[PDB]
Assembly symmetry: C2
Homo-oligomer: 325 residues x 2
């Protein structure tokens, strides 16, 4: 069976700063499993899809926590490698930008950044129908090349390559221009997901507009593009048309990792092989149907200061779609 969704990249700890409780009581931080591709993997596993997380975890308490969290969720762990050379990355989340949500990362150096091409396993790509990655595994030259090689290997092995930009400027070296790597990753993906802001960023790097960006994507492997709005309406584009994705109102909005997990999960269930993506992209009726499912997953996922605390099961997602209909 070649139905496994391979999520590659970083898995890290989101440390959620809690509000001050009493007097000089020490502030508390809550430990939550995180990482863009990691969240996608857990969302897929919760729905019942075959999924594996490929990446490097530290040989520390946090790495053990992430490993066990993956196992408990049903995510295959065979492709995970370990290292004592660096610690598991930490992402501290709090408030200080006045009342804004602040971020403090312990990642210029981290375990996930040390994954090398030699760590990939042929069995992973043999059984993979989808390879999903994000730009965080492109923050330095070495890890970026590993991500590109994974995308190239996936394509050659018959897997659909999914790329959710998930651009986080803070994680990139000061003074360096990430444009080059982002465009390269974009040229190697069959399915691309961008936020409105990232689309604007990319347009600026071209000294042009959104249309120019989309046309640039069509010059590569891209067959499907999703653009998320801060608000909530997701737009989709293929080389033959464009439209909107049905949304859901379930009280908390922009499509994130759960949405992606929902989408890839459906792809793996419905596609016999990678070539099936082409027919899918030529059929707006299927596109709308599948993205509605993805939106339902995103709407049901529960987050706390970012970081997912609960992913929905298939029955719950289908019930929402059935009800809100």
């Amino acid at each position: 069976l070649k139905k496994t969704i391979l999520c590659f990249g970083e898995a890290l700890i989101d440390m959620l700063a809690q509000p001050l409780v009493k007097k000089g009581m020490p502030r508390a931080f809550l430990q939550c499993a995180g990482g863009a591709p990691a969240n996608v993997a857990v969302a897929v596993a919760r729905l019942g899809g075959a999924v594996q997380f490929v990446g490097m975890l530290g040989s520390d308490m946090f790495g053990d926590f992430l490993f066990d969290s993956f196992a408990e969720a049903g995510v295959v762990t065979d492709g995970i490698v370990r290292t004592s050379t660096a610690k598991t990355a930490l992402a501290f989340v709090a408030l200080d930008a006045h009342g804004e949500r602040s971020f403090s990362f312990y990642r210029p150096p981290a375990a996930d950044l040390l994954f090398r091409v030699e760590h990939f396993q042929d069995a992973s790509f043999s059984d993979a129908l989808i390879f999903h990655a994000c730009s965080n595994s492109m923050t330095d030259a070495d890890i970026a090349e590993v991500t590109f090689e994974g995308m190239r290997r996936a394509q050659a092995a018959g897997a659909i390559v999914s790329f959710d930009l998930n651009f986080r400027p803070m994680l990139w070296p000061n003074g360096e221009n990430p444009a080059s790597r982002l465009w390269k990753g974009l040229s190697l993906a069959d399915v691309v997901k961008l936020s409105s802001e990232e689309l604007d960023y990319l347009a600026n790097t071209l000294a042009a507009d959104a249309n120019a960006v989309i046309q640039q994507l069509w010059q590569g492997r891209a067959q499907l593009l999703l653009v998320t709005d801060a608000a909530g309406p997701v737009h989709w584009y293929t080389r033959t048309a464009g439209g909107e994705v049905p949304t859901f109102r379930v009280q908390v909005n922009a499509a994130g990792d759960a949405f992606v997990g929902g989408m890839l999960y459906t792809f793996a269930q419905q596609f016999d092989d990678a070539a099936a993506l082409i027919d899918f992209c030529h059929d707006p009726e299927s596109i709308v149907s599948t993205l509605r499912f993805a939106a339902a997953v995103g709407a049901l996922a529960v987050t706390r200061q970012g970081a997912f605390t609960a992913m929905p099961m298939l029955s719950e997602v289908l019930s929402l779609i059935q009800e809100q209909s």
Copy 2:
């Protein structure tokens, strides 16, 4: 003059909390930490004039440490900041079979980037005591910075205090700390060791405790204090030794008391030649150190008071 200059690392201790409810995320409590940093705070709480010299990150944790120093009464103008690295983190959780584990996010770290040019002459000319620990010797650069600070202090007339506080886990894999430890020990006037560290040092010499003590007398050391997990504190000088009839609290009480008793660095020598004073001062140091922690002062209050009365009578 009068100020106690504590130099080195200030970091965040993240204490893992026992799981309250299965489905809830494990919690970690933030606490100001760092060896010389904690001593600086204790001295300040006791009422001594103290300044912490070191580098703090420009992050949320650095601001927390800076504020903690300020609130305790520690002088902060000797503190420098950097965005180049994050404030170090020290995770202590009860990992595996009831044993308390550790996970340090150091190196890299902001405190490791303090450079010689960050020292201010004003800090040294006003210092009666310069106190350091081995944590600021974990890499070649910060170690040299620490040694130069100790030399500057000595040259400026400050008593140099060195609390080994050896933590192997913080040192580079495959390296032997012995060399740096001995160099630091050779530059201190006052040395504080745990019984364990004494044995460790003895081994580096392939000898006994006496060999370590004699080696110490080869450098600047005039007073050695050796603490026990469970037992009296042993003191040693170049002419004698004995025990104090009674950890970091102790070091705080000691520095605080030394600063209250000694007019200058030369006063340490007279002190070392006066066992009665050594005994009285260290016992008091241990006792008053408990205050750097409405509360009861008993039985310590009466114990201290009865002794002074008897001595005066």
